[PDB]
UniProtKB/Swiss-Prot annotation:
Something else known: Skeletal muscle troponin C binds four calcium ions.
Domain EF-hand: 11-46, 47-81
Source species, domain of life: Eukaryota
Family under the similarity heading: Belongs to the troponin C family.
Binding site for Ca(2+) 2: 60, 62, 64, 66, 71
Descriptive protein name: Troponin C, skeletal muscle
Function: Troponin is the central regulatory protein of striated muscle contraction. Tn consists of three components: Tn-I which is the inhibitor of actomyosin ATPase, Tn-T which contains the binding site for tropomyosin and Tn-C. The binding of calcium to Tn-C abolishes the inhibitory action of Tn on actin filaments.
Span of the entire protein shown here: 8 to 88 of 163
Length: 81
C-alpha cells in the first residue's frame, strides 16, 4: 500500500480514484459485495455472492470484507506488474 502510491504517477492515481469513486456508490470509503456485484452486472456479468467474496478476499488485507482505496490501488498495481 506504500509502494503502490510510489510506483504510480499522480495521473494514474487520479484516474484510479475516479473509477473507485464510481464503484463506491454510497460514498462511504470502501466497496462492498453489493457495490461490486452491481457494477459487474453492468458489465454483463452475473456473479454470485461466493464469487464476489472470493474476489474481495484476494485484495482484502485488513479482513474488513470490503475494498478500500489503498487495497484498490494494489489490485491495479499488481495488475500492471
Ligand atoms: Ca461503499
Ligand atoms: Ca479491506
Amino acid at each position: 500500500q506504500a509502494e503502490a502510491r510510489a510506483f504510480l504517477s499522480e495521473e494514474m492515481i487520479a484516474e484510479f480514484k475516479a473509477a473507485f469513486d464510481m464503484f463506491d456508490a454510497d460514498g462511504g470509503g470502501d466497496i462492498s459485495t453489493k457495490e461490486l456485484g452491481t457494477v459487474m452486472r453492468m458489465l454483463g456479468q452475473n456473479p454470485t455472492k461466493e464469487e464476489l467474496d472470493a474476489i474481495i478476499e484476494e485484495v482484502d488485507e485488513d479482513g474488513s470484507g470490503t475494498i478500500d482505496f489503498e487495497e484498490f490501488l494494489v489490485m491495479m498495481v499488481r495488475q500492471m506488474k
